[PDB]
Structure 1
Amino acid sequence: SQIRQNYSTEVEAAVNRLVNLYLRASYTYLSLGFYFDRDDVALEGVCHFFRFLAEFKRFGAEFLLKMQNQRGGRALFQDLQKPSQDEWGTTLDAMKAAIVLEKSLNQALLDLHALGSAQADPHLCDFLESHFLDEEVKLIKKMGDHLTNIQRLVGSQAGLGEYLFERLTLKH
């Protein structure tokens, strides 16, 4: 490449893997969103929360691909694994699965940041810091806040709590 400078093959490959992880996360959120749109689930705010995250993770993948080309690396796409479940249980089950997924993406971001620091690639490090690390901490905090509110609403009237959370916390 006529532009590539200070961009290791190790970083290039790890960026392609991170693109796959974000596209997989987007797919997981698409499945979560349409589960909550089922006529036998019918939680509009929950559907909208996860459909927004599906678009937000696709955006993250596209930002990584733009950066891959800016650095002179080569995008390489792999098969995208289907999500881990076909049915996602309750809002609580879904929000737990979402925070597990986000902690996995956050650890992948931290791992790539550590590789960039080891390879003295400050453009890679700054790119993650400026576009991903704080967005990810803020999303995980939001999901933790939601999990606590869902948990406090279960009590012995689980259906009432799940309705109220969707109506009074989530955007619909």
Structure 2
Amino acid sequence: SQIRQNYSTEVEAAVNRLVNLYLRASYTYLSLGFYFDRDDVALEGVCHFFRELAEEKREGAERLLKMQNQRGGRALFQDLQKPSQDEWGTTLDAMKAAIVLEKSLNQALLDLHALGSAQADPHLCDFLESHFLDEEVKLIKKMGDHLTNIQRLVQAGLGEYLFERLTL
């Protein structure tokens, strides 16, 4: 590439892998959202919470792809694996799966940051810090807060209704 400068093949490949992880996460949240929209589940606030996250993760993938092109790297897409479950249980089960998913995304971001530092790529390091690292910390804190409130509420049906009505 005529514009490529200080951008290693290792970072380029890791960025493509991270795009795939963000799109997989968006797909997982799409599945979580529509599960809570089932007439036999029917928790609208929970459906809204996860649909908003599907949108945020798709936006993250798109930002990564834009950065890949700005640096002269080449986007390469892979098959997007289906989510790990077809049915997601209670709000508590769903929030626990979501925090597992976010921690895995955060770890991938931290691994990519470490790779960037190793490769002396400060543009990459700044990009991640600016657009992703703090967003993930904030989101994981919010999910942890939700998990604590859900757990405090377990008359489990009553608690699940109240959380959806009064928090979400």
Q: Which residue of 2 aligns with 1:151?
A: 151
How many Å apart are 1:58 and its aligned residue?
0.1
Q: Name structure 1 gaps, 5 residues minimum.
A: none
**Where has structure 1 moved over 3 Å in runs of 4 or more?**
none
3-state DSSP of counterpart to 2:83: coil
What is the CA deviation profile of residues 122-153 of structure 1, one whole-angstrom value per residue up to 9, with x for unaligned ones? Answer: 00000000000000000000000000000000
Indicate the percent of aligned positions where both proteins have the same amino acid: 98
How many Å apart are 1:120 and its aligned residue?
0.1
CA RMSD of aligned residues (A): 0.2
- Output the TM-score relative to the length of structure 1: 0.98
Residue pairs, 1:18-57, within 5 angstroms: 18-57=18-57
How many Å apart are 1:16 and its aligned residue?
0.1
- Output the TM-score relative to the length of structure 2: 1.00
Separation in 2 of the partners of 1:45 and 1:123?
38
How many Å apart are 1:23 and its aligned residue?
0.0
Q: Name structure 2 gaps, 5 residues minimum.
A: none
Q: Which residue of 1 aligns with 2:92?
A: 92
What is the CA deviation profile of residues 25-55 of structure 1, one whole-angstrom value per residue up to 9, with x for unaligned ones? Answer: 0000000000000000000000000000000
Separation in 2 of the partners of 1:33 and 1:79?
22
Separation in 2 of the partners of 1:40 and 1:124?
45
Separation in 2 of the partners of 1:28 and 1:115?
27
Q: Which residue of 1 aligns with 2:133?
A: 133
What is the CA deviation profile of residues 93-134 of structure 1, one whole-angstrom value per residue up to 9, with x for unaligned ones? Answer: 000000000000000000000000000000000000000000
3-state DSSP of counterpart to 2:3: coil
Separation in 2 of the partners of 1:40 and 1:91?
13
3-state DSSP of counterpart to 1:101: helix
